[PDB]
Each structure stands twice: as structure tokens, then as C-alpha cells.
Design a protein around this nucleic acid. Structure first.
Ligand SMILES: [Mg+2]
Ligand SMILES: [Mg+2]
Ligand SMILES: [Mg+2]
Ligand SMILES: [Zn+2]
Ligand SMILES: [Zn+2]
Lengths: 124, 93, 74, 99, 101, 192, 54, 124
RNA sequence: GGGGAAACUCACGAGCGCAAGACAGAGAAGGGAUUGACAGAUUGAGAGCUCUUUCUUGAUUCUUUGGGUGGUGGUGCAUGGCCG
């Protein structure tokens, strides 16, 4: 198990920070968001192809100061962001995978215990 | 009364700038060494500096945000102009 | 009066133009013979119709469409 | 002075351009057709209403398959539609349009 | 023309909170209360009536929009978590009657 | 004080306010018979009495239309919540109100109910409520593509004189059809 | 890059104003600061409180 | 919910019986597998087009003796069978839908409780 | 025709700019839809209009297929209202 609490709190956080303007999405977006030290916490998609993307991102989190999380699949990122093409049956079909997500700020409806749950997965 | 005439074309149709985007191109800004150090091989903007990179056109440094313009010494300008010219002559042919 | 396409006086014009619409396939069929006149008597001269106000009696074709058969049954 | 601009309509197949020759009555006329034949035209129920036609006007004429000798007056050309026809190269450049 | 995210949110916010929105026609000016450039309001609200959450009435240069129940359900969606709690000032039921002899 | 305003320019401005209200209410209130509006103005407040045939639809389902309206006036002019007050007042006799009755035949004509019958129904209603006389004018295409004008009178009617402005109540409506706009006037001469 | 939109001065003259009701610029009545075209005025006149005694 | 236990036990069963030779796949395969009374249990895909396939299959289960299960979608059958075209990112894209599956025998790694879970969905 | 029009008004004319092309279906998009803009040409015009030039920006959506907004465009012999 991916530890459903981790993926659930991750889902609620990425949703919350998207409904509010403060999420950030994309390798150019996440770039400057990391460098400006705006990003409080950042998510990396593990499976994807250019050695650079993951290397540069993890290294940039290390090279200013940022904590990161590692998600196995990209379609999960796209889904969490609410990037999906929804069928009229309420079925989510087409999902554009993401690579890196930078959350600039947190939405106030975040529970203390949930945040304390996030903080454990934040390594490096 | 009067009626609108059928339209007469005087001058040729014009095209609009599409947006040039190099895919996953944002990785060209940073280089990594074996230690893992992060090296910035573009130039950052003195006002916008941490995350935003300026543009190196041959003679100028230009910020996409604050429109900062920093003009180069003319020799570097001519050298870069000449080089890029000689390269485009090659790619176009 | 600046709308003209076809030649005036062409022979088959209106009939050729008309779209071909197919006659609807009927569920079951229309009873032939006596039974039909039974059907007519029923929907027309039957006791319940007579019982209603003869000046307010409803004319036989009043409904073309089915929405007023739904309004008639209610 | 003019009625609303509408597209100059060309001779479709089954029609021919014509110029009014003389006036008959009962809404009839003799026309010279650029087919090269003279014909005796009748005026449209449409045109009888709207556009009054007279001598030496340039008209569009709907033809008849069976009787070639009769033809129906379809539409009258405004002198500008005509000069335009000459421009386009539909009808011959030597023709007399009177105002 | 780009209607920015915070613009969008700000107006959806004010909608849900109030339940009613008002627009003078000029695309030049700004909306008095929310202080938003009008073209942007016109756009957001335009789409909102075009999907039926909004019902529109027009008086002396001013368009008046009032929210439907489908509206609550749209705004819940785009504003997410925040909108769990809220019912608009329109939807709140009045407890006292205004009809007087 | 707020601003010193021309008694003339102020008063004209007050009238223009009133008219804007009347247009607003006749326009947004169109389903319940709307007659009139009466505006009292206090340094504290602005009180609006909406005189109407069906107050029940002015209020709505527990102040759906009421709250909507009140907030509309609020965003429009800018107002404190204590500064605006809306009351709805019933018109005790619906047969003596024109705007109401014209709304009635608006309605009946939308449902394709024939002209003469509808006209008669309302006229009979109006006189049933004690009005000395009434008249209805319907204009526009009725029969065909060529415009007609049909008048229906019963009872007592005055047109000319200052008494006109007193006893006669009039309202018009534009009625919409697939064919175009047709239109309808109702003149109820009131009783004494 | 609509920057040039409506950028000609409407400060004064015919385009500075309009009917509050019908938004006409023509034959506008400005006289009591009531900003209403002649037709629209003629209509609203009894609601504004303007009688014809005369 | 399709009752994730049902789809999970179904998945593990169809996999197990494919890794072992004893699964059977196809309308000609499932035909003779049903008729020989070899099939212990059979799966039918609900959405698909020829009225015949579903009618004949359900009727054949009834007409010798066989218990059947009803899966809403065909792509799910294909996936369970391990019929998929897998992307180098570990993403399953192309899936050939199935219609009828006949499991001849069960693999010994089947749990008792899982089998007792199967038995409930087996109606008709 | 409140018809005293320098711009505006304004429908006319010559040359340029925007979309305020909603909404639905299909495909495209987060590894990028799209916005913006120094500077050189360019232009009547510090209209990034175009072209070279890249940097920004981060779904506010792009391409088709439908389709709405908008129209001082026509028709007072389709009409309301008003008015002679
Ligand atoms: Mg003049
Ligand atoms: Mg229209
Ligand atoms: Mg125009
Ligand atoms: Zn800068
Ligand atoms: Zn006006």
C-alpha cells in the first residue's frame, strides 16, 4: 500500500491549493517557484523520461532549501491536479500526466494533524 | 437607400505571431555537475533574479517580466551577430 | 425579389425537390371490414360520447399529433 | 438611387442572357437572345410585381425545354450589373445600354 | 484577453457570498463593489448565464444577475473545500414576513 | 449633510430615481401583478412600498425574490443594510388595477386562448369589481401578416378632459409571439 | 494589446454623455442634470413627476 | 462500488488460472469448455454487440450446469486476462476486450476465504 | 429627424487593431494550451501590427464540427410604442 493517508492528504492538498491560486504546475513554473523560494513543498513524478527533469528538480530542492515527495506515477499527478477529461457517466478517462508540482502556499482548511502527516513524507 | 459594397482587397493578408515554445526547454537554463551542484548558465534579472532568467539576444539582455534591457559592449554584439548569422545561413539552406 | 436559382417552367421541379420521407412502419395493423366500423362507432357514436354535451362534442380529427392524445387521456 | 445590392447572377444552365427588342403587351415581349435566337418572352409573376421592364433593357431569361420559341423573363439587370457583366466577360462588349 | 485566476476566484467568491451580481455596461469602467475591470466580469458572468446557473434582467444600462441552485453546485466545484459551508445570502431563508396591510 | 444639492437638480434627480425603480420593478417583477411603487426617504432609510396584486410572488419562497431584489438595489446604488427597506403592499381590488389586468390578458393570450373570449373575461372581471366601464385595445398582426386593431368596450368611458387623468387608469404591454410583437392596452375608468 | 481601444478623448461634446435609459447620444436633455433623450423623457415624464398643465 | 473484493478476487483468479494452463478464452473456446463440463465457473462481459453472445452463453451455463458472473465492461476482462499492450513507463494502454472466459480449474494458491467469496457472486 | 458634424458624434470614404468566436461534441494540451514584451527593421502611429529576436506567462484555453453574443445593415407594405 502506498499508505492511503499519504495519497489522500496529497490529494486534498493539491486540490485545495489548486482551487486557491497558490499551486504551481510545470517545469518552467516549478523552476522559478523553487528558485524564488516561494514553494513551501514540492512533488516529483518518478516515472518519466529525461534524466534531467528528476535530477535537476531534486537537486534544486536541495540547492536552495525545499522538501520533496516522490510519487510513482504521473497520471496520478494529473488526476490530483484535477487535470482529467471527464465522461458524462462521471468516469475519468483522459489524464495528462504531470512531472513536477510546486505548492506556493497552503489553504487554511488544512488540518493540523494532516499537516503533521505531510511533514513525515517530505524527506530531502 | 445605400448598401454595403462587396469587399475589395488592396494589400496582401498578414499573419500573426504564433508562440515559439521549445519543449521541455526550461532545462536549458540549469546544468549539473557530479557533486550535484546547481549551475546557472543563463543570466538572471537583477530585479527579478532568483527564478527568472533574462534573454540573451546578441546585443541585449532582456527580461520577460520587467522588460529590463541591458545593452552589451558592441564587440561582443558584432561577434555574436556574425556567428548567429553564419549559422542561420547554414540551417535555412 | 433577388432570390432565384432554378429555371422557371422546368417540368418536375417541386416534386423532384421534395425530400423523400418514408411512411412509418405500423405496429400491428388497421382492422379491415366490420371491425373497423365497430372502432368508429366506439370512438364516435358510442353511449359516452352521446352523453356529453352535443354542442361541446369534440371533432373527430382535432388531434394530428400524439401530445394531445396524451392530453386527451389525462 | 438603387435597390439593395445583391450578387449579379450569371446565366445558369437552362437560361440565357437577353436584350429587349419590342413591346407586345399582356406582359409579353420579343427578346434577342445571346443564344443567337429571337424569342417571345413572358414576364414572371414575380417581375410583374416588382421590376418594370422596358425597351433595350438587359434581362436574364429562363428557357423552356420543349418550346424553344417561348422563354420566360426571369430578372432585369441594373445598368451597373450590366457594365459589370461586360467587365467579367459574360456578354459582348459592344451592346447598347440606355439610361 | 486573459481573466486571471484570482480575478475568477474573487468574483465567484463574491457571487456565492452574495448570491446576486450587478454590471453596468461600459467595458471600460470597474465594477463598483468588487472593484474589478468590467470586461473580465462580463466574461465570467457571460459564461455563467450561458450555462444556466445565472438569470439575467436588464435596466437602464445595468444588467442584473441572480443565482440559481445549479449555481451553488458550480461554485462548490470550482472553489472546492471552502464552499462546503456556505449558502448565499439569497438562499438563506428570511424568517419574517414583509407584507403589510 | 452629504452634499448641498440644487433643490431643482435634487428634485429632478429624485424623480429620475423613482422612474429607474419603476422600470426596474416592472421589468424584474413581471409575473406577479405589479402596480405601483411608493418611496419614503429618511436620513436613516429608504422605504419602498411595492403595491402589487400577488405580494406572494414578490416575497417568493421565503424571500428568494425579496432578498434578491433588496440585494439588487444594494449593489446598484450602494446602500447600507439598514438603509434599504422593501415592503410589499396588497392592492385590495385587482379589478381596479390596469397593469394587473393587462398582465392577465398577456398571460391568457400566451396560452393561445382566443381574443374576444379573453377580452370578455377580463372586462367582465373589471366590471364585476365595480369599475364603471372598461376598454381594451389589441393592435398588431392578429389574423394575418397585415396589421389589425381591435377595440373592446363595455360600460362607461371618458377620454377627454382633466377627469381623464383622474378616473381613467391605463396600462400597456408588449406581448411576444413567433410572429412578432403584438400589443395591448387596458383602460379602466374607475368608480367614484 | 488592445491598448489603443477607446483611447480618443470623450471628455466633452456629444460623446461625453448619453441617455441613462436608452443610451442615445442624440437630442439628449441635460437641463436639470437628468440625462434623458427627448423620447425616453417623454415616456418617463409622469414617473419623474413632470406634468403637462399647458 | 463494484465491491473491490469481487474485482480483486476475480483479478487474482483470472491471473492465477492464466499463469497455469487451465483458463480458457473465447467464444469457441468457452463453448466447448462449457459443453464438456470442464468449466468450473464462467465470466460474461455485459456490454458487447451481438444479442446472441450473451444469450447463448448464459443459456449454455444454465443448460448443462454452470455458475456465471457478470462483468460490466470488456476492457476489464482483457486486463484481467493480462491482455494489454504495456508502455515502457509501466502504463497499460491498448486493451483488447474479451466477451466470455471459462476457468477450467483453480490454482492451489487460492485461499479458502477467497473461494468462499467467489461463491457468492456466482448466481445462475 | 432637437439634424448648430472640426475629433468623437457616424451610418460614408482610405489604411490599420482587437474579440468582448459564449455554450456543447471531437481532437490537442501540464514534458504546455495561450498572454505579454524590450531592441532592430516596420508603420501614419512607443499598433508586439508584422519580421528577426528570445524571455516571460501557466488554463484565463488552440484546431476543427456545430452554434451564440454583436450589428446606426434591409424591410413602416411584416409589427408594437409613440407621432403627424
Ligand atoms: Mg447635414
Ligand atoms: Mg440578434
Ligand atoms: Mg458599426
Ligand atoms: Zn526582470
Ligand atoms: Zn433615451
Amino acid at each position: 500500500d502506498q499508505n492511503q493517508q499519504l495519497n489522500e492528504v496529497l490529494a486534498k492538498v493539491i486540490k485545495s491549493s489548486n482551487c486557491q491560486d497558490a499551486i504551481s504546475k510545470g517545469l518552467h513554473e516549478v523552476l522559478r517557484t523553487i528558485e524564488a523560494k516561494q514553494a513551501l513543498f514540492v512533488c516529483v513524478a518518478e516515472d518519466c523520461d529525461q534524466g534531467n527533469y528528476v535530477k535537476l528538480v531534486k537537486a534544486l530542492c536541495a540547492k536552495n532549501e525545499i522538501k520533496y515527495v516522490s510519487v510513482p506515477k504521473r497520471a496520478s499527478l494529473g488526476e490530483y491536479l484535477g487535470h482529467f477529461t471527464a465522461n458524462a457517466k462521471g468516469e475519468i478517462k483522459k489524464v495528462k500526466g504531470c512531472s513536477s508540482l510546486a505548492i506556493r502556499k497552503y489553504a487554511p482548511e488544512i488540518t493540523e494533524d494532516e499537516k503533521k502527516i505531510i511533514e513525515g513524507a517530505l524527506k530531502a | 437607400k445605400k448598401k454595403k459594397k462587396k469587399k475589395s482587397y488592396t494589400t496582401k493578408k498578414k499573419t500573426k505571431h504564433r508562440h515559439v515554445h521549445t519543449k521541455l526547454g526550461a532545462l536549458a537554463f540549469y546544468k549539473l555537475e557530479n557533486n550535484g551542484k546547481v549551475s546557472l548558465q543563463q543570466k538572471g534579472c537583477p530585479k527579478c533574479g532568483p527564478g527568472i532568467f533574462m534573454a540573451k539576444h546578441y546585443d541585449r539582455h532582456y527580461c520577460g517580466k520587467c522588460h529590463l534591457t541591458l545593452k552589451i559592449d558592441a564587440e561582443t554584439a558584432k561577434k555574436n551577430l556574425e556567428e548567429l548569422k553564419k549559422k542561420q545561413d547554414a540551417k535555412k539552406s | 425579389m433577388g432570390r432565384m436559382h432554378g429555371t422557371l417552367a422546368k417540368a418536375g421541379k417541386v416534386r423532384k425537390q421534395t425530400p423523400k420521407v418514408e411512411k412509418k412502419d405500423k405496429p400491428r395493423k388497421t382492422p379491415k371490414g366490420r371491425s373497423y366500423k365497430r372502432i368508429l362507432y366506439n370512438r364516435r357514436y358510442a353511449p359516452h360520447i352521446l352523453a356529453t354535451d352535443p354542442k361541446k362534442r369534440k371533432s373527430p380529427n382535432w388531434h394530428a399529433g400524439k401530445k394531445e392524445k396524451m392530453d386527451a387521456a389525462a | 438611387e438603387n435597390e439593395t445590392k445583391r450578387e449579379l447572377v450569371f446565366k445558369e444552365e437552362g437560361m440565357e442572357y437577353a436584350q429587349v427588342i419590342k413591346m407586345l403587351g399582356n406582359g409579353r415581349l420579343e427578346v434577342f437572345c445571346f443564344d443567337g435566337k429571337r424569342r417571345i418572352g413572358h414576364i414572371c409573376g414575380r417581375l410583374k410585381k416588382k421590376v418594370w421592364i422596358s425597351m433595350d433593357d438587359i434581362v436574364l431569361v429562363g428557357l423552356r425545354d420543349f418550346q424553344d420559341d417561348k422563354c420566360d423573363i426571369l430578372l432585369k439587370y441594373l445598368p451597373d450589373e450590366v457594365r459589370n457583366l461586360k467587365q467579367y466577360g459574360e456578354i459582348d462588349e459592344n451592346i447598347k445600354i440606355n439610361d | 484577453v486573459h481573466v486571471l485566476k484570482a480575478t475568477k476566484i474573487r468574483i465567484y467568491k463574491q457571487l456565492l457570498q452574495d448570491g446576486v451580481f450587478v454590471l453596468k455596461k461600459d467595458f471600460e469602467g470597474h465594477h463598483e463593489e468588487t472593484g474589478v475591470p468590467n470586461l473580465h466580469c462580463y466574461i465570467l458572468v457571460r459564461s455563467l448565464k450561458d450555462r444556466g446557473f445565472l438569470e439575467e434582467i436588464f435596466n437602464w444600462g445595468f444588467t442584473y444577475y441572480y443565482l440559481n441552485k445549479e449555481g451553488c453546485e458550480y461554485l462548490k466545484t470550482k472553489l472546492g473545500i471552502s464552499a462546503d459551508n456556505v449558502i448565499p445570502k439569497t438562499f438563506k431563508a428570511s424568517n419574517v414576513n414583509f407584507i403589510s396591510k | 449633510t452629504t452634499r448641498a444639492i440644487n433643490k431643482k437638480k435634487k428634485f429632478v434627480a429624485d424623480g429620475v430615481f423613482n422612474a429607474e425603480l419603476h422600470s426596474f420593478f416592472s421589468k424584474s417583477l413581471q409575473d406577479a401583478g405589479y402596480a405601483g411603487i411608493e418611496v419614503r426617504r429618511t436620513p436613516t432609510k429608504t422605504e419602498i412600498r411595492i403595491k402589487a396584486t400577488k405580494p406572494q410572488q414578490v416575497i417568493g419562497v421565503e424571500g428568494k425574490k425579496h432578498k434578491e431584489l433588496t440585494q439588487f438595489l444594494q449593489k446598484r446604488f450602494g446602500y447600507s443594510d439598514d438603509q434599504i427597506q422593501i415592503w410589499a403592499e396588497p392592492i385590495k381590488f385587482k379589478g381596479l388595477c390596469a397593469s394587473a389586468q393587462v398582465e392577465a390578458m398577456n398571460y391568457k393570450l400566451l396560452k393561445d386562448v382566443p381574443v374576444r373570449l379573453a377580452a370578455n373575461y377580463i372586462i367582465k372581471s373589471v366590471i364585476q369589481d365595480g369599475a364603471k366601464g372598461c376598454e381594451i385595445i389589441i393592435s398588431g398582426k392578429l389574423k394575418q401578416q397585415r396589421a389589425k386593431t381591435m377595440k373592446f368596450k363595455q360600460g362607461y368611458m371618458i377620454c377627454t378632459g382633466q377627469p381623464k387623468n383622474d378616473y381613467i387608469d391605463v396600462a400597456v404591454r408588449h406581448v411576444f409571439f413567433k410572429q412578432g410583437i403584438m400589443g395591448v392596452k387596458v383602460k379602466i375608468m374607475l368608480p367614484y | 494589446p488592445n491598448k489603443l481601444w477607446r483611447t480618443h478623448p470623450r471628455n466633452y461634446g456629444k460623446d461625453s454623455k448619453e441617455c441613462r435609459v436608452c443610451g442615445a447620444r442624440q437630442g439628449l436633455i441635460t437641463k436639470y442634470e437628468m440625462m434623458t433623450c427627448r423620447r425616453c423623457f417623454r415616456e418617463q415624464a409622469p414617473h419623474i413627476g413632470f406634468v403637462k398643465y399647458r
